[PDB]
Paper text:
We isolated and characterized two Shigella podophages that have notably different features when compared with classical podophages and instead are most closely related to phage N4. We describe the isolation and characterization of phages [name] and B2, including whole-genome sequencing and analysis, cryo–electron microscopy (cryo-EM) structure determination, mass spectrometry, host range studies, and enzymatic assays of the tail proteins. Our work shows that these phages have divergent decoration proteins and unique tail structures, and encode and package their own phage-dependent RNA polymerase, and the tails, which display esterase activity, are dependent on specific O-antigen modifications of lipopolysaccharide (LPS) for entry. [name] and B2 are similar to bacteriophage N4—these are all T = 9 podophages, which encapsidate their own polymerases—a hallmark of this phage family.
We also analyzed the data by imposing icosahedral symmetry to visualize the capsids at high resolution (3.6 and 3.4 Å for [name] and B2, respectively). Both capsids have a T = 9 geometry. The [name] of each has the HK97-like fold that is present in most, if not all, dsDNA tailed phages. Using DALI, both the major capsid proteins of [name] and B2 are most similar to Ralstonia phage GP4 (37), another T = 9 podophage with an RMSD (root mean square deviation) of 3.0 and 3.2 Å, respectively. The decoration proteins of both [name] and B2 bind the capsid proteins at the same quasi-sixfold symmetry axes in both phages but have notably different folds. [name]’s decoration protein (gp28) displays an immunoglobulin (Ig) domain–like structure that is similar to Hoc in phage T4 (39). The cryo-EM density map of [name] was sufficient to clearly model the first 183 amino acids of 273 total residues in gp28. The C-terminal portion is likely also an Ig-like domain that forms the trimer spike similar to Hoc, but the resolution of this region was too poor to accurately model. Whereas the capsids of [name], B2, and GP4 are highly similar, it seems that the capsid decoration proteins may stabilize weak points in the capsids in different ways.
Residue numbers in the entry:
A (entry chain G): 52 to 401
B (entry chain H): 152 to 301
C (entry chain H): 352 to 401
D (entry chain K): 3 to 182
E (entry chain H): 1 to 51
Amino acid sequence: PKNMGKTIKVYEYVPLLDDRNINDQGIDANGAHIVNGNLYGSSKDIGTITSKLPLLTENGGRVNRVGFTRLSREGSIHKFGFFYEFTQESLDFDSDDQLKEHLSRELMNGAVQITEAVLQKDLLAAAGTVLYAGAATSDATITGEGSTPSVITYKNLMRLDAILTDNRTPTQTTIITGSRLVDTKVIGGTRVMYVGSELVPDLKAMKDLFGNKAFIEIQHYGDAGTLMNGEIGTIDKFRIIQVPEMLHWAGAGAAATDANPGYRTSTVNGTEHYDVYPVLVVGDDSFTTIGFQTDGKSVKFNVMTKMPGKETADRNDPYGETGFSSIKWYYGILVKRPERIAVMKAVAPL
Amino acid sequence: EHLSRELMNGAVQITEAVLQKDLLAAAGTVLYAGAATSDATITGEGSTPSVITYKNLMRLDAILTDNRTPTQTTIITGSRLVDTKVIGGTRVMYVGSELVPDLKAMKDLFGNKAFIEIQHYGDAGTLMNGEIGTIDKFRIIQVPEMLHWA
Amino acid sequence: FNVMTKMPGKETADRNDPYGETGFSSIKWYYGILVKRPERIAVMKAVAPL
Amino acid sequence: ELKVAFNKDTYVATVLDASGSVPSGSVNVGTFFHPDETYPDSYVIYHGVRELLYKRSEVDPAQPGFWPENITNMQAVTIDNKATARLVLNTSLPRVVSTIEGGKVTLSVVALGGKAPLKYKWEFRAPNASTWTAVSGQTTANLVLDNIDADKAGEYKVTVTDAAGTSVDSTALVAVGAYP
Amino acid sequence: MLNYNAPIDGQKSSIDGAGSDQMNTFYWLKKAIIQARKDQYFMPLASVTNM
């Protein structure tokens, strides 16, 4: 709402037995004042659980006290906008007669694309599970030429599935049992991946764990299940969607040398650097786009054309021969639960 | 309201934690994967790390047949669909999240994949909740919160 | 589960606090196990990857 | 920290200061911080004494005990605070103090309690800064900013420390109106 | 120029003088992030011999 600031804040009510429920209020099974107050927290160790059980004697008194916490989470709005100018002679002495429309359309399309790109950037930024394919510890160590390169493999996607399941991230789809049509297969994917258009060559050749093809294309299960648009295949537990406009860091990898086996490499200050490509999976109910004054829609553009003539004259132009047209909008997201978004950074083949 | 909610969920989770711990501690047929004979000698470095292998699960059931542990689930004899398989799973086995990757990439006696997953046998098998597949004769269930010794 | 909660007010008012401004809520239960046949429980131990 | 001492015979729980003297018979029942570090203005001498006695056996205060047998009937426990009063700030620096270049501003602070020697100290934070440049020569519990200029605008804070060490502080934002 | 409709980051707006800040600097969404009861897998497979 208006007259209410430029940020939105929520509450996250941490459960009792969580490793984030820190509180001073805490009493042991003997009346002592133990530091923590979350019993044993998110500890799946047998010793910790056995030691911190809430044993309470038959003449129960003031033992076994536990506290609770609540965590806030914020998110703001940022503005955007761009324009273009046009002399009257440009629209009056031109071979074409619909230049104004052919610029307004070509501007609105660009604005929509910009909104998509900034949403993609924010999603790739706010990722709780930022997972590095291969043997990379940081972005600077995502290489493609060393003894162990950084390429997407079956084990890495298995690890992403494991991490997403452990974070209690929900499934998006259901497994597809077989059909009766020969040469078809059974996909077993419940998550939805969003690879770029450059990892597909490498992602179409992963040799499973036992050197078998690990990319069941869409044609092998179109009969027995629904087909989501943009699909190219399934891998382990990830129904794969190719995103044509997929953002990719360029030069945020390692140093490039002559041993480069054919992986994409950009240039950052002379010496070439490897390019890092993301594999983004966003879970259900992980973010919300706070639309300010945008009724229903996430982003509402405002057109401000002003035709040259008597509506643009001023002391700065006693003749009034120039106009303009501008588009502006507000955009911003609140990542309420940044544990569903996950990314595999990796290189891509040339 | 939220305070009471969290209290009740904590109570339920802690109760199942106690059940898990007691069932683990009351195990009669305890076996150790790899070249191990005690907890203090269980390892993960050397010639023989304690990694679950097809032989180890085979030895597990052999004891569960001598000890007369009754079978719980029947065998899937196959379906009419295309890329389904048969399942010899009789007993139900529970695994933590940690050991699942090591079971996914574990070879059978001929050097291939033996982790037929839930997506293969769905038409015939009445797949139970938390199932991830059967290896040889055990139908594996993932336990989201399964305790362990640290 | 047995729950007994007393809200601040008349309920908690006593002589160790003649204003009644301190509540509490407590949950208690009983638990145990009878293991009849221990040979039908077969745990196995190993090490899993990082 | 306030040492408490209990005398079962007279059921008296004298709350002495850290450096007190357990009265004849009064057994050290324990110590506690009256201005609870976490929640200062949420607890009183009673709460501390009560808990200190809840963990002491009825049969013998000296001997620790728990719920089954402990001193919990505070109705009888006679608490006699023989400890220094909590340093308080009846008068605190005027939240905001607006003036013009020239107008004298006086910041005042009245502290009651603590150890008798109530020392004062004034610190000044310039606008858009973090360092609290201590106003040199100010120990008076009253800072007269006569003929104030625009530079002397900003936040001014006191620190009433008692001989013991406990310190009560108060801040006042001085705003000076400048003119070409 | 009167501006800056939201100084959340300690950047006081123009209209507000000394000892004053915007009454509301954000919106408060009622729906709270809540984690559900953990999945149970061993209590169901129990039996009760009443004592």
